[PDB]
């Protein structure tokens, strides 16, 4: 299928409390594999996946050197924006970026990302033509115009076609085994008593990976789209994820309902029932 | 490998 290499960058200014906080975090197909945090002592580029340790000591010196440069870059960016928006030098603000690429299974460059956001809102991003930019507000037009002057798009296009695509291939070569791991969910239903003649049936899905999953309750052939309570998938904190869907039902009539768990790691969708 | 970032 498709794969991608993306970087989530953050630069948050803290008034008086010292210089700004800077971070870079890499993801290969949605999995963190590297991280540079300007706070931990000896701010360096650390691998975040055992498979990244096969990188020479030279890979990390260089990435660290580059990160420290990018960092100086964002201290400037922070000050600059304080200017465009006319915001006192006292506040605490945030710049975030998502830079990377997504290439299909045919090796073709599906998508190249270069998005900036200021204080939680879109600021400026590169269009799908990898040729033009989209400004989010009046401020971002200043940036847009500067970047069109300098030919920043040609710079990014060069990166996307060389470095991005090329190292995504390498990271994938070293990560294959680990990245394609798939833990099927273990599911069960719990019985809880609601006020009067009613009960809550809860379907639990545990220890699965990747996070993508779908749980549905069934009242004889139909799906309870309406009255179904269900939590946002959450991490167990050990590599896997959890989730549950619960439905309120008439006491004694619990057998009329069935839970269904659809996961990519399952040979076939699971069918669940409240077991006394 | 992360790209190098210019200025806003």
């Amino acid at each position, epitope marked *: 299928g498709p794969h991608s290499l993306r970087y989530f960058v953050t630069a948050v200014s803290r008034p008086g409390l010292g210089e700004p906080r800077y971070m870079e975090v890499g993801y290969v197909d949605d999995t963190e594999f590297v991280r540079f945090d300007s706070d931990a002592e000896n701010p360096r580029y650390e691998p975040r996946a055992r498979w990244m340790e096969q990188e020479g000591p030279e890979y990390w010196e*260089r990435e660290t050197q*580059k990160a420290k*440069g990018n960092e*100086q*870059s964002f201290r*400037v960016d922070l000050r600059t924006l304080l200017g465009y928006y006319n915001q006192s030098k006292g506040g605490s603000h945030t710049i975030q970026v998502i830079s990377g690429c997504e290439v299909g299974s045919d090796g073709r460059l599906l998508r190249g990302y270069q998005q900036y956001a200021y204080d939680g809102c879109d600021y400026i991003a590169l269009n799908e033509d990898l040729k033009t930019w989209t400004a989010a507000d009046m401020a971002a037009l200043i940036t847009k115009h500067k970047w069109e002057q300098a030919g920043e798009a040609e710079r990014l296009r*060069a990166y996307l076609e*060389g470095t991005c695509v090329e190292w995504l291939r390498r990271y994938l070569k070293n990560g294959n085994a680990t990245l394609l791991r798939t833990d099927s969910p273990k599911a069960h239903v719990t019985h809880h008593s609601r006020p009067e003649d009613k009960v809550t049936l809860r379907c639990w899905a545990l220890g699965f990976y990747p996070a993508d999953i779908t749980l549905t309750w069934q009242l004889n052939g139909e799906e309870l789209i309406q009255d179904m309570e269900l939590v946002e998938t959450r991490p167990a904190g050990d590599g896997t994820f959890q989730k549950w869907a619960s439905v309120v039902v008439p006491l004694g009539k619990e057998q009329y309902y069935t839970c269904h768990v659809y996961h990519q790691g399952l040979p076939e969708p699971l069918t669940l029932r409240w077991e006394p | 490998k992360v790209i190098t970032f*210019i200025d806003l």
Partner: T-cell receptor
Amino acid sequence: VTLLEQNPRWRLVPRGQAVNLRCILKNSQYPWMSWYQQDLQKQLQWLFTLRSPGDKEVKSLPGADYLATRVTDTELRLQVANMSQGRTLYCTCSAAPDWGASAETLYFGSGTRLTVL
Amino acid sequence: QQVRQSPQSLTVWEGETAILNCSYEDSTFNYFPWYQQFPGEGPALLISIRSVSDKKEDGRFTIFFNKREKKLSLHITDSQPGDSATYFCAARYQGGRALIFGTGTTVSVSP
């Protein structure tokens, strides 16, 4: 051409004294400023790349000792002391460390030629 | 030591094809620009190539890139009185601060 303004173009140096070169950045879209030297046998070599004010770095080489400092967002300084032999110095600017100014590659001016005594 | 070209000197009859070699040791180098220096002023870009390509043609110049062997070459096909100058072969890696230059190759095209 004309992103930087480097002076003088040619210069003489009393072998006991040090020299102070200065580079003035014209367009600010290319913050990254560097120093390259071409020695008498024609070998070009990067010396420094500074980005922000307050930055100072000393690097010593066969023929000269160096001290580069980024004084402001437009002024990059280089003082060359103990200059035993001749070398010609070039100042450059770029968008990012691994890119040119508005172009993919670094651009060199006429530089400043330094002939001893 | 990172980049090194050869031969350091070369002469060729006008209308003839001069050929300059170059080689490097950092397999991470992704950009290779060739600069043309005429006695008197700074190095000026002549022709460049990206590691993702293996051939770059512009006018009478041609870069041959062999990513496998870490070797490139410039072909000044149909030389000329003027093409005479010193030719540097440079290289760099993504995120790198410096541009590494080869030791140069002086070329003289005598009519």
